[PDB]
Design a protein around this ligand. Structure first.
Ligand SMILES: CN(C)c1cccc2c(S(=O)(=O)N[C@@H](CCC(=O)O)C(=O)NCC(=O)N[C@@H](CCCNC(=N)N)[C@H](O)CCl)cccc12
Ligand SMILES: *[C@@H]1O[C@H](CO)[C@@H](O)[C@H](O)[C@H]1O
Ligand SMILES: *[C@@H]1O[C@@H](C)[C@@H](O)[C@@H](O)[C@@H]1O
Ligand SMILES: [Ca+2]
Ligand SMILES: [Ca+2]
Ligand SMILES: [Cl-]
Lengths: 254, 96, 154
């Protein structure tokens, strides 16, 4: 998160930090006590599937107060259509070994109805992304949770305003861009998997997932987000269906 | 020459002649070049979420209706959601 | 379906109609309007017109810069096709009414030109309200600087 404020403690309670072997990995979003949405490609290089750890309630990485809750990740689920090392279908669903406990510092983000998201939410101009990622492309990561407020664009406005670059990814139906072009503010490498959250009439909803861009706050580019609207049926089907055995699982999509 | 003589305006708003043109002041409940739109009718979902707090279902030839997300129930005004639990999604307790 | 083109603000004395091309053959239009940093409000839902009145929207805060866009949908029915109006700041760009109360209505009443321009408003050469042919002027403006001459009186 380049350009943001520090998120005052407890004010981004759906934020999740994923760890492997106690090393920083990605962010995630609590949509449920048992369930965390992340970015698929966070798992591109994963060799140690038993040691995936999810941490809710976290704020400051260096010092541990009483609010952080740790849980083992039981299953990571990826869309069938996701291809490792590409940016399409960039989303992950994670079941935690055991539930977290909702408190003033751990709360799930509402996962909205798909049509509500398409017709109403998509047209709230500013939403919040957040995470412990880099504070500048190639720079340090964050110790306290960071948060940034960003304007969404419709894909045509995005293509028009973006600078054509040889062999860049295609902005798809399963993405959107958000943010700025004056090279001042964006999400960044630490942040993949974390919330793009939309306030509407007193309730925060999950509309996006930090996914990819051309470096971070590059002049002439925006940040791309997984378009969370497209997977609402798929996620729901998964949270209600009965557990499959495997640790990684590629679910059919749609 | 005055254009308003042609009685262009509708729904009882006054006209005012302009050059090669005119204007139409409407009453509050109406808009349009000639005040021909009733604002009341569009109690539909794409119109500002139907006035619902969270969710909206249109129907056929009948008033829309509003709904609440899991962990919320609907109030007696038929537009508002209230939490039915301690920690409903999408709310932040240290500001609530 | 084809995307709207050549969109324009028609604005006089604050009454603002957005106009576009073409006439819909088997397709409908929806319009959206916003301030530069505000949420997108929708109007004129699935009309077959080439116009949308947006007096009530723009009038709520005349000093904002507005942006409009128009959406195409095949009749009878992953973003819809649309195209953008140019930027419209009412206070600076609205054409001035050939002089004898504007469209801005605070509290059920159309404010007068002076209720809206205060000191920014002169005439032709008087800061006050006084063969004769008067034009109204705003010193400050880049564009649409002055109304046409009132009807002559002797
Ligand atoms: C043809 N080649 C070799 C390329 C050149 C430049 C960019 C490429 C990208 S990319 O545009 O998607 N950029 C990569 C990284 C390269 C770069 O940034 O220069 C990316 O964002 N990958 C996904 C990623 O790392 N996402 C992190 C969050 C990124 C958020 N970024 C922004 N909002 N800008 C998350 O931790 C996973 C993808 C594939 C090939 C690229
Ligand atoms: C006279 O009335 C017609 C229709 O009401 C209008 O279109 C003209 O512009 C006006 O002069
Ligand atoms: C012109 O003003 C508008 C508001 C209407 O009240 C008309 O009756 C009047 O003549
Ligand atoms: Ca800590
Ligand atoms: Ca005339
Ligand atoms: Cl556990």
């Amino acid at each position: 998160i380049v350009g943001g404020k520090v998120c005052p403690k407890g004010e981004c309670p759906w934020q999740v930090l994923l760890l492997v072997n106690g090393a920083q990995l990605c962010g995630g979003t609590l949509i449920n006590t048992i369930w965390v949405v992340s970015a698929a490609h966070c798992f591109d290089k994963i060799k140690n599937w038993r040691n995936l750890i999810a941490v809710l309630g976290e704020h400051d990485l260096s010092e541990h107060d009483g609010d952080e809750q740790s849980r083992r990740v039981a299953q990571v689920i990826i869309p069938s259509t996701y291809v490792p090392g590409t940016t399409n279908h960039d989303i992950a669903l994670l079941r935690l070994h055991q539930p977290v406990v909702l408190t003033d510092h751990v709360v799930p983000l509402c996962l909205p109805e798909r049509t509500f998201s398409e017709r109403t939410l998509a047209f709230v101009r500013f939403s919040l992304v957040s995470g412990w990622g880099q504070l500048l492309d190639r720079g340090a990561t964050a110790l306290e949770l960071m948060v940034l407020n960003v304007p969404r664009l419709m894909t045509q406005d995005c293509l028009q305003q973006s600078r054509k670059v040889g062999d860049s990814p295609n902005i798809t139906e399963y993405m959107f861009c958000a943010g700025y072009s004056d090279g001042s503010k964006d999400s960044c490498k630490g942040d993949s998997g974390g919330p793009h959250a939309t306030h509407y009439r007193g309730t925060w909803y999950l509309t996006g997932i930090v996914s990819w861009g051309q470096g971070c706050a590059t002049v002439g580019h925006f940040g791309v987000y997984t378009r969370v609207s497209q997977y609402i049926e798929w996620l729901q089907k998964l949270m209600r269906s009965e557990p499959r055995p495997g640790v990684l699982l590629r679910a059919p999509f749609p | 020459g005055d254009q308003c003589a042609s009685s262009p305006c509708q729904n009882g708003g006054s006209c005012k002649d302009q050059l090669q043109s005119y204007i139409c002041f409407c009453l509050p409940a109406f808009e349009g070049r000639n005040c021909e739109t009733h604002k009341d009718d569009q109690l539909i979902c794409v119109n500002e979420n139907g006035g619902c707090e969270q969710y909206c279902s249109d129907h056929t030839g009948t008033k829309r209706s509003c709904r609440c997300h899991e962990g919320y129930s609907l109030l007696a005004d038929g537009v508002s959601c209230t939490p039915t639990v301690e920690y409903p999604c999408g709310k932040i307790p240290i500001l609530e | 379906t084809v995307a709207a083109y050549n969109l324009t603000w028609k604005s006089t004395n604050f009454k603002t109609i957005l106009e576009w091309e073409p006439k819909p053959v088997n397709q409908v239009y929806t319009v959206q309007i916003s301030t530069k940093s505000g949420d997108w409000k929708s109007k004129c839902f699935y009309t077959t017109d080439t116009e949308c009145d947006l007096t009530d929207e723009i009038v709520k805060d005349v000093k904002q810069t507005y942006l409009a866009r128009v959406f195409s949908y095949p009749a009878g029915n992953g973003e819809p096709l649309y195209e953008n109006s140019p930027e419209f700041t009412p206070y600076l760009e609205t054409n001035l009414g050939q002089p004898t109360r504007t469209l801005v209505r605070r509290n059920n009443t159309f404010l007068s030109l002076r209720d809206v321009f205060g000191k920014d408003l002169i005439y032709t050469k008087t800061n006050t309200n006084e063969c004769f042919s008067v034009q109204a002027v705003i010193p400050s403006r880049t564009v649409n600087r002055k109304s046409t001459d009132s009807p002559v009186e002797c």
